[PDB]
Design an enzyme around this catalytic site. Structure first.
Site, mmCIF file in Angstrom:
data_model
loop_
_atom_site.group_PDB
_atom_site.id
_atom_site.type_symbol
_atom_site.label_atom_id
_atom_site.label_comp_id
_atom_site.label_asym_id
_atom_site.label_seq_id
_atom_site.Cartn_x
_atom_site.Cartn_y
_atom_site.Cartn_z
ATOM 1 N N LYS A 202 0.872 -1.167 0.000
ATOM 2 C CA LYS A 202 0.000 0.000 0.000
ATOM 3 C C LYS A 202 0.910 1.219 0.000
ATOM 4 C CE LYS A 202 -3.028 -2.582 3.025
ATOM 5 N NZ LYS A 202 -1.881 -3.521 2.770
ATOM 6 N N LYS B 54 -13.078 -7.061 -5.730
ATOM 7 C CA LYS B 54 -14.383 -6.425 -5.571
ATOM 8 C C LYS B 54 -14.293 -5.077 -4.839
ATOM 9 C CE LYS B 54 -17.218 -10.625 -5.835
ATOM 10 N NZ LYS B 54 -18.464 -11.291 -5.230
ATOM 11 N N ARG C 286 -4.738 -6.245 -11.076
ATOM 12 C CA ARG C 286 -5.526 -7.186 -10.289
ATOM 13 C C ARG C 286 -6.924 -6.615 -10.107
ATOM 14 N NH1 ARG C 286 -3.452 -6.804 -4.600
ATOM 15 N NH2 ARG C 286 -1.667 -7.978 -5.511
ATOM 16 N N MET C 287 -7.972 -7.362 -10.481
ATOM 17 C CA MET C 287 -9.340 -6.900 -10.221
ATOM 18 C C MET C 287 -9.792 -7.466 -8.914
ATOM 19 S SD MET C 287 -9.397 -5.257 -12.844
ATOM 20 C CE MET C 287 -8.771 -5.157 -14.541
ATOM 21 N N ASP D 46 -1.183 -1.903 -4.231
ATOM 22 C CA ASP D 46 -2.560 -2.220 -3.856
ATOM 23 C C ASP D 46 -3.385 -0.948 -3.891
ATOM 24 O OD1 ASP D 46 -1.874 -4.860 -3.455
ATOM 25 O OD2 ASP D 46 -2.182 -4.832 -1.283
ATOM 26 N N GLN E 109 -10.842 -1.793 -8.201
ATOM 27 C CA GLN E 109 -11.926 -2.309 -7.382
ATOM 28 C C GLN E 109 -13.276 -2.176 -8.060
ATOM 29 O OE1 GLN E 109 -10.705 0.782 -5.029
ATOM 30 N NE2 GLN E 109 -9.931 -0.386 -3.260
ATOM 31 N N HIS F 241 -12.664 -14.941 -4.360
ATOM 32 C CA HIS F 241 -12.932 -16.283 -3.881
ATOM 33 C C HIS F 241 -14.360 -16.706 -4.231
ATOM 34 C CE1 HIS F 241 -10.389 -13.892 -1.238
ATOM 35 N NE2 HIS F 241 -9.595 -14.955 -1.253
ATOM 36 N N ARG G 198 -10.568 -10.736 8.094
ATOM 37 C CA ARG G 198 -10.908 -12.097 7.683
ATOM 38 C C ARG G 198 -12.063 -12.632 8.524
ATOM 39 N NH1 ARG G 198 -7.990 -9.782 5.300
ATOM 40 N NH2 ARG G 198 -9.949 -9.323 4.279
ATOM 41 N N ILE G 199 -11.993 -12.430 9.842
ATOM 42 C CA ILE G 199 -13.103 -12.778 10.734
ATOM 43 C C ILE G 199 -14.413 -12.091 10.320
ATOM 44 C CG2 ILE G 199 -14.027 -12.692 13.120
ATOM 45 C CD1 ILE G 199 -11.216 -12.912 14.183
HETATM 46 C C1 LIG Z 1 -5.139 -11.422 -3.848
HETATM 47 C C2 LIG Z 1 -6.093 -10.353 -3.334
HETATM 48 C C3 LIG Z 1 -5.558 -9.064 -3.162
HETATM 49 C C4 LIG Z 1 -6.502 -8.037 -2.665
HETATM 50 C C5 LIG Z 1 -7.804 -8.340 -2.373
HETATM 51 C C6 LIG Z 1 -8.341 -9.690 -2.535
HETATM 52 C C7 LIG Z 1 -7.437 -10.659 -3.024
HETATM 53 C C8 LIG Z 1 -7.955 -12.071 -3.224
HETATM 54 N N1 LIG Z 1 -8.705 -7.375 -1.878
HETATM 55 C C9 LIG Z 1 -9.967 -7.700 -1.163
HETATM 56 C C10 LIG Z 1 -11.127 -7.709 -2.122
HETATM 57 O O1 LIG Z 1 -11.459 -6.386 -2.436
HETATM 58 C C11 LIG Z 1 -12.340 -8.410 -1.563
HETATM 59 O O2 LIG Z 1 -12.665 -7.710 -0.407
HETATM 60 C C12 LIG Z 1 -12.096 -9.879 -1.192
HETATM 61 O O3 LIG Z 1 -11.465 -10.572 -2.229
HETATM 62 C C13 LIG Z 1 -13.435 -10.620 -0.905
HETATM 63 O O4 LIG Z 1 -14.206 -10.572 -2.080
HETATM 64 P P1 LIG Z 1 -14.566 -11.798 -3.023
HETATM 65 O O5 LIG Z 1 -14.138 -11.581 -4.490
HETATM 66 O O6 LIG Z 1 -13.953 -13.046 -2.344
HETATM 67 O O7 LIG Z 1 -16.199 -12.041 -2.858
HETATM 68 P P2 LIG Z 1 -17.095 -12.026 -1.621
HETATM 69 O O8 LIG Z 1 -16.748 -10.957 -0.574
HETATM 70 O O9 LIG Z 1 -18.344 -12.046 -2.381
HETATM 71 O O10 LIG Z 1 -16.943 -13.450 -1.138
HETATM 72 C C14 LIG Z 1 -17.174 -14.587 -1.970
HETATM 73 C C15 LIG Z 1 -16.936 -15.865 -1.165
HETATM 74 O O11 LIG Z 1 -15.606 -16.072 -0.764
HETATM 75 C C16 LIG Z 1 -15.502 -16.740 0.452
HETATM 76 N N2 LIG Z 1 -14.838 -15.826 1.381
HETATM 77 C C17 LIG Z 1 -14.506 -14.501 1.186
HETATM 78 N N3 LIG Z 1 -13.943 -14.009 2.287
HETATM 79 C C18 LIG Z 1 -13.875 -15.022 3.253
HETATM 80 C C19 LIG Z 1 -13.421 -15.103 4.562
HETATM 81 N N4 LIG Z 1 -12.825 -13.978 5.198
HETATM 82 N N5 LIG Z 1 -13.528 -16.245 5.240
HETATM 83 C C20 LIG Z 1 -14.064 -17.357 4.687
HETATM 84 N N6 LIG Z 1 -14.536 -17.314 3.413
HETATM 85 C C21 LIG Z 1 -14.460 -16.184 2.689
HETATM 86 C C22 LIG Z 1 -16.925 -16.970 0.856
HETATM 87 O O12 LIG Z 1 -17.288 -18.221 0.379
HETATM 88 C C23 LIG Z 1 -17.657 -15.904 0.140
HETATM 89 O O13 LIG Z 1 -18.983 -16.188 -0.128
HETATM 90 C C24 LIG Z 1 -8.313 -6.044 -2.063
HETATM 91 N N7 LIG Z 1 -9.334 -5.091 -1.863
HETATM 92 C C25 LIG Z 1 -8.975 -3.739 -2.118
HETATM 93 O O14 LIG Z 1 -9.878 -2.774 -1.960
HETATM 94 N N8 LIG Z 1 -7.707 -3.335 -2.531
HETATM 95 C C26 LIG Z 1 -6.738 -4.302 -2.717
HETATM 96 O O15 LIG Z 1 -5.531 -3.946 -3.112
HETATM 97 C C27 LIG Z 1 -7.063 -5.709 -2.461
HETATM 98 N N9 LIG Z 1 -6.014 -6.694 -2.605
#
Ligand SMILES: Cc1cc2c(cc1C)N(C[C@H](O)[C@H](O)[C@H](O)COP(=O)(O)OP(=O)(O)OC[C@H]1O[C@@H](n3cnc4c(N)ncnc43)[C@H](O)[C@@H]1O)c1[nH]c(=O)[nH]c(=O)c1N2
Length: 272
Positions: free
Chosen positions: A73, A165, A162-163, A110, A141, A205, A267-268
């Protein structure tokens, strides 16, 4: 014993534990993406100490035979602070990228909250010009209204992006409040970047989105060398393994360091 829990999501508290974790991912055919954690970074001195610690990480990874791939960051290394008339984040990022590049490595900038998007994308453009698009990447994002426009504006750099959410608590004047819109926009960002032929990291994920991206890549004849899936350490380890076994590139984000409480708490918070 928060640590008995946090060990799922955090490599450990030392450079040594991080390197060991990358080596384990590599044995499973998965790449690593290192993230030093830190909390106190609120002074020019501490921001530069943090940068130096990222450099120590890069040296240790290189010594251990790993191609350095690290995410930072820019706020943690001084973005928004002026030191002798230049932005401290830009100065420290140059030191960090130069060192990663010397060892054939890569740094991802990031993306933080909405107030830092313009400066980060300006700095990213500057740094790509200085070090090359093969050595520095960034993040967009999908929850932001502005992201599609931002992605298109960077196409001249053929950038590695990197995309995600989106991780921050952003108001509806800045971010889509409906999760359905966040998810649709995520696909749009991924697909537009892939159609432009730019390297794309699909950091999610969400298995529905993962399946649709697999579908898209197949339908468009895109090679598995042209993009990768990215996941946080400890989340959907089954998909990480399965995607690697199906031939996809998978790179897992590995946080480490003593200051893990806030990261662990997020994460929690996001437990389904
Ligand atoms: C490698 C990488 C790097 C980054 C980021 C993510 C990743 C994977 N993020 C965070 C990102 O913005 C987003 O908040 C998370 O990836 C969670 O979103 P999902 O795409 O998983 O979907 P979503 O939040 O919809 O979750 C989909 C599913 O994933 C599983 N899951 C997700 N989180 C979990 C958890 N804590 N415990 C257990 N299961 C879980 C669950 O099954 C959940 O239904 C980030 N954001 C940002 O604003 N700037 C950044 O630079 C980054 N960098």
């Amino acid at each position: 014993k928060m640590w008995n829990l946090a060990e799922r999501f955090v490599a450990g508290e030392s450079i040594e534990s991080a390197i060991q974790a990358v080596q384990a991912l590599e044995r499973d055919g998965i790449a690593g993406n290192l993230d030093l954690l830190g909390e106190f970074i609120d002074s020019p001195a501490k921001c530069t100490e943090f940068a130096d610690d990222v450099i120590k990480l890069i040296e240790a990874a290189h010594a251990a035979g790993i191609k350095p791939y690290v995410s930072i960051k820019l706020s943690s290394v001084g973005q928004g602070k002026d030191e002798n008339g230049e932005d401290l984040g830009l100065t420290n990022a140059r030191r960090i990228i130069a060192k990663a590049k010397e060892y054939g490595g890569f740094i991802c900038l990031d993306m933080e909250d909405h107030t830092r998007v313009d400066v980060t994308l300006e700095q990213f453009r500057t740094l790509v010009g200085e070090f090359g698009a093969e050595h520095v990447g960034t993040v967009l994002q999908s929850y932001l209204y502005r992201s599609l426009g931002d992605r298109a504006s960077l196409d001249d750099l053929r950038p590695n992006i990197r995309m995600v959410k989106g991780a921050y608590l952003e108001p509806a004047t800045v971010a889509y409040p409906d999760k359905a819109d966040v998810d649709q926009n995520y696909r749009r960002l991924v697909f537009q970047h892939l159609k432009a032929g730019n390297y794309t990291n699909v950091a999610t994920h969400d298995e529905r989105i993962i399946d649709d991206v697999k579908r898209f890549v197949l339908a468009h004849g895109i090679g598995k060398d042209a993009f990768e899936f990215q996941m946080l350490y400890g989340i959907r380890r089954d998909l990480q393994k399965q995607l690697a076994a199906e031939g996809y590139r998978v790179r897992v984000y590995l946080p480490y360091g003593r200051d893990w409480y806030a990261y662990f708490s997020r994460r929690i918070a996001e437990t389904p």
